């Protein structure tokens, strides 16, 4: 009741505070998947329902 | 002493009924290879078949 006294009207405590949030930016991708490192091994069609 | 008289018996037999059943699981893989071997040709690996 008395510390937000000095935290809700006009007077003010031997602490204080520090704004943030958790806001919004980014990144993405576009590679160079290579000539000799990267793969598969060719084939199939086979079934079960 | 004429008292004798041959007798013939007539017994009949029932046939009854039995059976044997068993399960035989096909893997999708074995019937898989199956499917090509029925149309075995230049394709469909022979070592596989």
The answer to whether B32 contacts chain A (CB < 8 Å) is yes
Q: Which two tokens stand for residue A35?
A: 């000539």
Secondary structure of chain A as H, E, C letters: CCCCCCCCCCCCCCCCCCCCCCCCCCCCCCCCCCCCCCCCCCCCCCCCC
> Which two three-digit tokens encode residue A42?
């060719």
Resolution (A): 3.1
Distance CA B48, CA A16 (A): 77
State which approach was used to obtain the coordinates: cryo-EM
A40 CA to chain B: closest CA distance, Å?
A: 20
With contacts defined as CB-CB under 8 Å, which chain B residues touch A47?
A: 28, 32
* Cα dihedral sign, A33-A34-A40-A45: positive
Separation CA B15–CA B13 (nearest Å): 7
Q: How many CB pairs under 8 A join A and B?
A: 7
Give the distance from residue A38's alpha carbon to the nearest chain B alpha carbon, in angstroms. Answer: 27
**How far from chain centre, in Å, is Cα B6?**
46
């Amino acid at each position: 009741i008395s510390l937000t006294h000095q935290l809700r009207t006009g007077f003010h405590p031997g602490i204080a505070f520090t704004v943030v949030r958790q806001d919004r930016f980014a990144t993405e991708q576009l590679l160079y998947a290579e000539r000799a490192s990267e793969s598969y091994f060719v084939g199939q069609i086979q079934v079960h329902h | 002493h004429p008292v004798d008289q041959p007798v013939h018996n007539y017994m009949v037999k029932r046939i009854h009924k039995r059976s044997l059943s068993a399960a035989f699981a096909i893997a999708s893989e074995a019937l898989s290879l199956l499917s090509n071997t029925y149309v075995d040709g230049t394709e469909i690996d022979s070592s596989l078949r």
